[PDB]
Design a protein around this ligand. Structure first.
Ligand SMILES: O=C(O)c1[nH]c(-c2ccccc2)nc1C(=O)N1CCOCC1
Length: 145
C-alpha cells in the first residue's frame, strides 16, 4: 500500500477495501509529491463554522452533524454519477468559489488550512476526497491538476 492508505474490510458486505486517513477517501481497488496542485471543493458550513455565513444563507444554523449528512449525500450522488462535482459545488457550496464551480486554482503548501492542504496533496489528480474538516466547515476536494 502507498503511505496514508489503510486496508480495511467492509462492515456490511465483507468486500475488503482501502481508506486514506488524510483525504478520508474510500475506494475498492488497490491504490497505485509536486510543488503545486489544483483543486476545487464544495464547502458546507455549520453553526460552529469560523464564519457561519455564506452567499447561500445569511446565518448558517445547521449543526456539524447535519453538515456531514449534506456532504455524504453530495458525495454519494457524485460517486454514482447522478450529479457532478461542479454542478453540486455551483448550487450548494458555501464558499465564494461556488460561482467558479468550486475551483481555486493552483496553490502550494503553506497557503491553506493544513487539513485542506494535507488532504489536497494526498489526492492523485482526478480524485475526490471524503469529508475533510477545517475551521470553515466540511469540504469535498477534487484535485484537478
Ligand atoms: O466564506 C468563505 O467563502 C470561505 N471559503 C473558505 C475556503 C476554505 C478553504 C479553501 C478555500 C476557501 N473559507 C471560508 C471561510 O469561512 N473563512 C476563510 C478561512 O476560514 C475562516 C473563514
Amino acid at each position: 500500500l502507498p503511505p496514508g492508505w489503510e486496508k480495511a474490510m467492509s462492515r456490511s458486505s465483507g468486500r475488503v477495501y482501502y481508506f486514506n486517513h488524510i483525504t478520508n477517501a474510500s475506494q475498492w481497488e488497490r491504490p497505485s509529491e509536486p510543488a503545486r496542485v489544483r483543486c476545487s471543493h464544495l464547502l458546507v458550513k455549520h453553526s460552529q463554522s469560523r464564519r457561519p455565513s455564506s452567499w447561500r444563507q445569511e446565518k448558517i444554523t445547521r449543526t456539524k452533524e447535519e453538515a456531514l449528512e449534506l456532504i455524504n449525500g453530495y458525495i454519494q450522488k457524485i460517486k454514482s454519477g447522478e450529479e457532478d462535482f461542479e454542478s453540486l459545488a455551483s448550487q450548494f457550496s458555501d464558499c465564494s468559489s461556488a460561482k467558479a464551480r468550486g475551483d481555486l486554482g493552483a496553490f502550494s503548501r503553506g497557503q491553506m488550512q493544513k487539513p485542506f492542504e494535507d488532504a489536497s496533496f494526498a489526492l492523485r489528480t482526478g480524485e475526490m476526497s471524503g469529508p475533510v474538516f477545517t475551521d470553515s466547515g466540511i469540504h469535498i476536494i477534487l484535485r484537478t491538476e
